[PDB]
Design an enzyme around this catalytic site. Sequence first.
Site, PDB file in Angstrom:
ATOM      1  N   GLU A  35      93.187  -7.271 -13.979  1.00  0.00           N
ATOM      2  CA  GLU A  35      92.429  -5.979 -13.244  1.00  0.00           C
ATOM      3  C   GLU A  35      91.574  -5.393 -14.158  1.00  0.00           C
ATOM      4  O   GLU A  35      90.269  -4.947 -14.726  1.00  0.00           O
ATOM      5  CB  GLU A  35      93.424  -5.825 -11.549  1.00  0.00           C
ATOM      6  CG  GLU A  35      93.648  -6.780 -11.179  1.00  0.00           C
ATOM      7  CD  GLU A  35      92.745  -6.090  -9.817  1.00  0.00           C
ATOM      8  OE1 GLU A  35      92.029  -5.243 -10.203  1.00  0.00           O
ATOM      9  OE2 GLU A  35      92.665  -7.095  -8.935  1.00  0.00           O
ATOM     10  N   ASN A  46      83.202   1.005  -6.306  1.00  0.00           N
ATOM     11  CA  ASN A  46      83.519   0.260  -5.765  1.00  0.00           C
ATOM     12  C   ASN A  46      82.089   0.365  -4.907  1.00  0.00           C
ATOM     13  O   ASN A  46      81.749   1.353  -4.255  1.00  0.00           O
ATOM     14  CB  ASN A  46      84.547   0.568  -4.465  1.00  0.00           C
ATOM     15  CG  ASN A  46      85.781   0.164  -5.476  1.00  0.00           C
ATOM     16  OD1 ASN A  46      86.127  -1.058  -5.757  1.00  0.00           O
ATOM     17  ND2 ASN A  46      86.830   0.424  -5.346  1.00  0.00           N
ATOM     18  N   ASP A  48      81.732   1.398  -2.074  1.00  0.00           N
ATOM     19  CA  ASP A  48      81.922   2.171  -0.306  1.00  0.00           C
ATOM     20  C   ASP A  48      82.051   3.634  -1.254  1.00  0.00           C
ATOM     21  O   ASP A  48      81.921   4.442  -0.396  1.00  0.00           O
ATOM     22  CB  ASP A  48      83.077   2.379   0.009  1.00  0.00           C
ATOM     23  CG  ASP A  48      84.194   1.630  -0.847  1.00  0.00           C
ATOM     24  OD1 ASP A  48      84.184   2.577  -2.114  1.00  0.00           O
ATOM     25  OD2 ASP A  48      85.348   1.995   0.197  1.00  0.00           O
ATOM     26  N   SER A  50      84.292   4.761  -3.524  1.00  0.00           N
ATOM     27  CA  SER A  50      85.342   5.165  -3.945  1.00  0.00           C
ATOM     28  C   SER A  50      85.462   5.132  -5.264  1.00  0.00           C
ATOM     29  O   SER A  50      85.048   3.434  -5.973  1.00  0.00           O
ATOM     30  CB  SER A  50      86.573   4.141  -2.825  1.00  0.00           C
ATOM     31  OG  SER A  50      86.030   2.794  -3.280  1.00  0.00           O
ATOM     32  N   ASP A  52      88.540   2.563  -8.335  1.00  0.00           N
ATOM     33  CA  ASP A  52      89.664   1.720  -9.004  1.00  0.00           C
ATOM     34  C   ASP A  52      90.270   2.189 -10.421  1.00  0.00           C
ATOM     35  O   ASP A  52      89.595   2.340 -11.182  1.00  0.00           O
ATOM     36  CB  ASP A  52      89.486   0.496  -9.134  1.00  0.00           C
ATOM     37  CG  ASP A  52      89.262  -0.428  -7.273  1.00  0.00           C
ATOM     38  OD1 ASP A  52      89.964   0.508  -6.583  1.00  0.00           O
ATOM     39  OD2 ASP A  52      88.793  -1.196  -7.710  1.00  0.00           O
ATOM     40  N   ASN A  59      92.934   2.033  -6.030  1.00  0.00           N
ATOM     41  CA  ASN A  59      91.748   2.331  -5.488  1.00  0.00           C
ATOM     42  C   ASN A  59      91.984   4.051  -4.336  1.00  0.00           C
ATOM     43  O   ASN A  59      92.596   3.814  -4.132  1.00  0.00           O
ATOM     44  CB  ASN A  59      91.931   1.293  -4.256  1.00  0.00           C
ATOM     45  CG  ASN A  59      89.929   1.995  -3.678  1.00  0.00           C
ATOM     46  OD1 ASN A  59      90.020   2.302  -3.441  1.00  0.00           O
ATOM     47  ND2 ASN A  59      88.988   0.319  -2.958  1.00  0.00           N
TER      48      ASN A  59
END
EC number: 3.2.1.17
Length: 129
Positions: A35, A46, A48, A50, A52, A59
Site C-alpha cells: 500500500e 482516487n 472519484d 477521494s 488514500d 480512504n
Amino acid sequence: KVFGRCELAAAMKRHGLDNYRGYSLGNWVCAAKFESNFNTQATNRNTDGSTDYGILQINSRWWCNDGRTPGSRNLCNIPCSALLSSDITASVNCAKKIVSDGNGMNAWVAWRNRCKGTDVQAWIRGCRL
Ligand SMILES: [Cl-]
Ligand SMILES: [Cl-]
Ligand SMILES: [Cl-]
Ligand SMILES: [Cl-]
Ligand SMILES: [Cl-]
Ligand code: NA
C-alpha cells in the site's frame, strides 16, 4: 517516516494489530509494504476525487476528513493528516475499524491482489518478536 520491515512489525504488534480480527501480523506488514512501501507520508488520489492516506492508505471517502471529498464520511473521526504521522497509532486504530466492517482485509485491494493466499509469514521472518 519510512519504517523498516521489522520496525513496523514491532510497532503494529505493540498496538495490538497482530491477529486482530484473525489476521496474523504478516498480513498487516504485507498490506503496508504494497500500500505504502512502509512510508507514513504516502498519499494517492482516487479516480472519484477521494484520497488514500498513510501506511495503510486509508480512504477519505469513508474514514477520515481531508476537507476536499464532497459528500464523504469521517467514520474514524480524524483529520486525514493524522494518518501521515510518524506515530502509527491513528492509522492502527482506524484500520481496526475498517477490518471490522464485514469485508475483512479485502478492503485493501493491494492485500487482496498481492498478499492474500501467499506466504505472508515471510514478512515477519527474522524479526525479534
Ligand atoms: Cl504471519
Ligand atoms: Cl470533505
Ligand atoms: Cl486540493
Ligand atoms: Cl509507532
Ligand atoms: Cl475476515
Ligand atoms: Na471524508
